[PDB]
A = this chain, B = another copy of it.
Amino acid sequence: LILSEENKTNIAVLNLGTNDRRNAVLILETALHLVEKYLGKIINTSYLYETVPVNYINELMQNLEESKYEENKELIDKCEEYETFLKNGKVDNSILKEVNVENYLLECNNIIVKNDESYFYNLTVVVKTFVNDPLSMLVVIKYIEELMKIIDIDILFFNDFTIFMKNIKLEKNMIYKILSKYIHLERFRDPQEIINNMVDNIEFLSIPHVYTTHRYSILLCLNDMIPEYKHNVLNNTIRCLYNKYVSRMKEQYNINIKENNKRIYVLKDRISYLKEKTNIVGILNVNVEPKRAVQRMFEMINEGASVIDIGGESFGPFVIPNPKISERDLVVPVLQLFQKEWNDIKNKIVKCDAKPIISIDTINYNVFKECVDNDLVDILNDISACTNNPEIIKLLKKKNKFYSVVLMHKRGNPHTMDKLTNYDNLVYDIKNYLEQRLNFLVLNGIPRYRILFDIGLGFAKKHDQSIKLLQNIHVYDEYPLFIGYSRKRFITHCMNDKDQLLYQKNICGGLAIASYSYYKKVDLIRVHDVLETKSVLDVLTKIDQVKD
């Protein structure tokens, strides 16, 4: 009943590990892609963590064998099997032989004790899987591992099952037989010489995985995705287990474990440590001739911007509608000239890790599709938090690429914004709103660690409400936070040729908010005045660097 024709939908929790800091993202993201291709749908992910307890991949992705199972990108609002899995409601009897608590505890404990005798990059995922059983799932997992010619993908959970199968002998053609049930094996190029590897790689099978409740890096991840979840073989919920291990660490060793184990977010393709640097995002409001616009982009890189945010649709208050030129026509050419002039890499080839991350400020599906088709951008800055056209969420995943996104809170539009100002609980309403939005992308397979939050200063907030959101920015301490205060009316509201005076004050007032952001450890600030902001951040950094 192992290769039962009775196709099912099960819930599996995986753990993905690599050891290589420089390639972690590509490595783990490659694994993510091969999970979505080969196992089912990703419907949850944790953050990426650095824990302390080359490029054949690019052309692996070309030469993949087709799955025998379909991919479906339609947005879902809800997933019933997941609700069921979280709740410990009823599912179909395991096809693999279970063990009771007592035996699991012993046979688990046994494996730990017996095991008694660098950097690690961790990530968990929930998969709604069409694979029948954990052992099969492992087979496929071992395929994926061997494909990536470096990666350790463990099965943390698989429904409410408890399984300790003690010795596993799998015939060389059963392994082929299993894979074929789920993959259009080309019978890399040749699957023959992969099988013989996997022959010995499955010794036993423990569900839950042995270390689930014993490795910090595991509980850290699971705490992100499924904090209220209580498996049968656990004293308490993930949260409690997580909390207990954190506070307990302070007693046994006075350790404060968060310090070793750093949360990560990703803007393009490298690690960023949450709360460890205030990146500048320079604004390019194209509203300006391509060549000119591109000079500005170059000015900005050199003035110290990590990110350029280009937009051709003005989202500021009461701004004028003018039918003359389309958002596409403004932004796409500019990005194309940029990518051209950058690619003239006769200049130092080492200065291509100088390349700015490119962000496009749009809600328009058509604009983003062209940008992504033509590799012109890295990030979607969607000021509707992807609510205006959620189809846009499907553009954040390619076969072998993930894009990051900024989710901003607003109400209404440029004309109505200033009216839509009532909030029962301003700070938490908005936070809860961004959490609801993040949950939505995450259910739809956007990596949690590629999603950035923005409270949308000046968008359906009075000026006191904008200040109040800054005063309470601490509520974002756990999240990658992106803000834009630059040149907004609320700065000027704070102050004791009239219009030139006011401009300067407003720019200088923004540098105060650069200072505040720096101390609040805001991850990105969206600014017009890049040289000024960089000067501020450089000085505050020196004042912090306390080495002799």
Name A's B-contacting residues (CB within 8 A): 304, 467, 470-471, 491, 494-496, 501, 504-506, 508-513, 515-516, 519, 531-532, 534-544, 546
A307, B486: Cα distance in complex, Å:
30
Residue of B nearest to A303 (CB): B501
Bound state CA distance, A539 and B488, in angstroms? 13
Q: Which residues of B contact A506 (CB under 8 A)?
A: 535
CB distance from A32 to the nearest CB of B (A): 35
Given contacts A508-B511, A512-B536, A512-B537, 14 further A-B contacts (CB under 8 A): A467-B542, A471-B546, A491-B539, A496-B534, A504-B532, A506-B535, A509-B538, A511-B511, A511-B536, A512-B535, A512-B540, A513-B543, A516-B539, A516-B540
**Most B Cβ at <10 Å: residue of A506, A516, A519:** A516
Provide a sorted-by-A list of 23 A–B residue pairs whose CB atoms are within 8 angstroms.
A470-B543, A471-B543, A471-B544, A491-B539, A494-B538, A494-B541, A496-B534, A501-B531, A504-B531, A504-B532, A504-B535, A508-B531, A509-B539, A510-B539, A511-B511, A511-B512, A511-B515, A512-B537, A512-B539, A513-B543, A516-B539, A516-B543, A519-B519
A146 to chain B, nearest CB (A): 45
CA gap between A467 and B547 in the complex, in Å? 11
Complex contact A467–B543 (CB within 8 A): yes
| Neighbouring B residues of A491 by C-beta, 8 Å | 539
CA distance A93 to B538 in the complex (A): 66
Of the candidates A467, A506, A539, the one having the most CB atoms from chain B within 10 angstroms of its own CB is A539
Interface contact B509-A512, CB-CB below 8 Å: no
Residues of chain B lying within 8 A (CB to CB) of residue A501: 531
A284 CB, nearest partner CB in chain B, Å? 20
Most buried by B among A506, A515, A541: A515
CB distance from A14 to the nearest CB of B (A): 41
Contact check, B519 vs A505: say whether CB atoms are below 8 A apart: no
B494 touches A542 (CB 8 A): yes
Instruction: Chain B residues near A467: list those with CB within 8 A.
Output: 542-543
Question: Which of A467, A511, A537 has the largest number of chain B CB atoms within 10 A?
Answer: A511
Smallest beta-carbon distance A537→chain B, Å: 8
Say whether A509 contacts B535, CB under 8 Å. Answer: yes
Q: How far is the CA of A527 from the CA of B470 in the complex (A)?
A: 27
* With A304-B496, A516-B543, A540-B515 as contacts: A535 and B505 at CB distance below 8 Å: yes
Which chain B residue shows the least CB distance to A542? B494
Whether the pair B538, A496 counts as a contact (CB closer than 8 A) is yes
A539 lies within 8 A of B494 (CB): yes
User: Which 5 residue pairs are nearest across A and B when measured between Cβ atoms?
Assistant: A515-B515, A512-B539, A508-B535, A494-B542, A509-B539
Hey, which chain B residues are within 8 Å of A494, CB to CB? Answer: 538-539, 541-542
CA–CA, A532 and B512, complex, Å: 10
The docked-state distance in angstroms from the alpha carbon of A546 to that of B472 is: 10
- In the complex, residue of chain B having the shortest beta-carbon distance to the beta carbon of A512: B539
Report the bound CA distance from A501 to B504 in whole Å: 17
**When chains A and B are docked, how far (Å) is the Cα of A511 from the Cα of B507?**
11
